[PDB]
């Protein structure tokens, strides 16, 4: 069973600009592990599968979180360290294009539909339970968990926002943008690592290591 109440509880429990952004990402990776443990049935997966899902999903999971945290911010993002970063500062640091994609495709769309924390948590749990992740011992089990999340999300949307029949589809259709933005952010991080001019802390660096 996959109650939206548990998914919401998990969200509530865990609540150079590039250098600050990377520092916040390292900090949030620790919190991300604690979040995943609070998602129903994640901790009952084999340890190797928990590792695979987190290594596959961490960037999208963290992007979804900071995007939603930023819904009341004008033209900027709020990092988990408390620092607001405006798009002017991101442009001035050479990451303007990807930052504008975050604002236009994620933050602004979350704001305009007033995406709530239950919906965010369910989208994040869908991302976490990614049955396409390579190396999973039992992909069908992860697929089944994803199916329970989206069934619960749809029921939640139909009950809470009955006047918005397209809302569930609208939520799911931010996932391709999240996927593309995550991939582009990952390219940037690998580049910062290659250049060597941006401090990258130990957990963020481990996520940039090759898989076993």
């Amino acid at each position: 069973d996959m109650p939206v109440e548990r998914i919401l509880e998990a969200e509530l429990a865990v609540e150079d600009p590039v250098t600050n952004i990377c520092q916040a990402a390292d900090k949030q990776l620790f919190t991300l592990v604690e979040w995943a443990k609070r998602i129903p049935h994640f901790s009952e997966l084999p340890l190797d599968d928990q590792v695979i899902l987190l290594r596959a999903g961490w960037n999208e999971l963290l992007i979804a979180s900071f995007s939603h945290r930023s819904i009341a911010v004008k033209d900027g993002i709020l990092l988990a360290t408390g620092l607001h970063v405006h798009r002017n500062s991101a442009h001035s640091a050479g990451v303007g294009a990807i930052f504008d994609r975050v604002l236009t495709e994620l933050v602004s769309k979350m704001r305009d539909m007033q995406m709530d924390k239950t919906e965010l948590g369910c989208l994040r749990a869908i991302v976490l339970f990614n049955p396409d992740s390579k190396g999973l011992s039992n992909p069908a089990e992860v697929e089944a968990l994803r199916e329970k999340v989206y069934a619960s999300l749809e029921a939640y949307c139909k009950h809470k926002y009955p006047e918005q029949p397209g809302r569930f589809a609208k939520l799911l259709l931010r996932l391709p943008a999240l996927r593309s933005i995550g991939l582009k952010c990952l390219e940037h991080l690998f580049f910062f690592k290659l250049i060597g001019d941006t401090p990258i802390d130990t957990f963020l660096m481990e996520m940039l290591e090759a898989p076993h």
Partner: peptide, 10 residues
Amino acid sequence: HKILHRLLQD
């Protein structure tokens, strides 16, 4: 995966 494994202990 050293840090991640350690943080996933129960």
